[PDB]
Design a protein around this ligand. Sequence first.
Ligand code: RK2
Length: 333
Amino acid sequence: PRGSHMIVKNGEKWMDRYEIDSLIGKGSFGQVVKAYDRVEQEWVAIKIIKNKKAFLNQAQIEVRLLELMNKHDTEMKYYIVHLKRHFMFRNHLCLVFEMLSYNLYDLLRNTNFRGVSLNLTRKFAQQMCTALLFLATPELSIIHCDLKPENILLCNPKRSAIKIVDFGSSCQLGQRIYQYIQSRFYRSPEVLLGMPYDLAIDMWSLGCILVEMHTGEPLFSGANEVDQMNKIVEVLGIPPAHILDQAPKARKFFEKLPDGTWNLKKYKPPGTRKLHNILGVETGGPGGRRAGESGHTVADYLKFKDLILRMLDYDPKTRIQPYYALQHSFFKK
Ligand SMILES: Cc1nc2ccc(-c3cc(N)nc(N)c3)nc2n1C[C@@H](C)Oc1ccccn1
């Protein structure tokens, strides 16, 4: 056997138990196959980790975090994909999951990137904030570290229930091992700036994800780290001095002046790309496509806009935390 991937043959049966149906996924971690578990009589998704020591080490962390989670009593743990069991087979670690449906990016593609309704956006946001409240449980303190539409799956194609997958980049608070993390579009300023991070980076990612779900377009579509930070500054302005003063990578993006103030190195002027206009609050919503529509009033959009700007706080110490996000007027019945 050569290369890092397992040789998968559709039709084969593993350990007189799993009937392999099809290769349904391929990522940097390895592969995902659909299999029929003859013993429990159900479809499962088997995540097959590459036989490369770095990947096996990180997948053992994923297993430990998923077993810590799936054992907590609360009904909140059901927003996290269920790890059924794991086993070694042909020198690969294999993680067995419940079979889920397609991811929120596929849902955007299905709308021809016009976005989903503010009402469906709100349902996704409530479940996501509840999942993040669960991860923030003191005995867990799990940072997902790779929230993106691709890592949020529908349970069922005809329903709005979601779960979070892929804890392959995850760590617990105080066990940071990667200086470079998060998918670029959803990467928090503290990570771009090479600072130590905490659970607040997942709330940043969530703010980005919810705007994209409603507009159909990434809020911050950087081609690279410098473009990413410049796109963030277009919307939010120059980060606070107290943060840049302790940021290892401040000078990758910004320059300190005699005055002790920071500006950009070497785009719209800072803070002039208003979320007000990105969302089309007063001009019929994204691309004007929601004009008049029920559920899409200026009052609705101003509540949504307010919660997003609390999620996109530059300061990880004052960025809105999940419990408080769930108390926001955006969610009030
Ligand atoms: C349909 C389905 N049910 C699933 C159940 C579990 C998982 C899954 C995938 C990964 N990376 N990490 C965990 N912890 C669980 N993925 C499922 N998928 C999507 C697979 C096909 O692709 C995907 C989906 C997401 C990411 C990569 N590839």
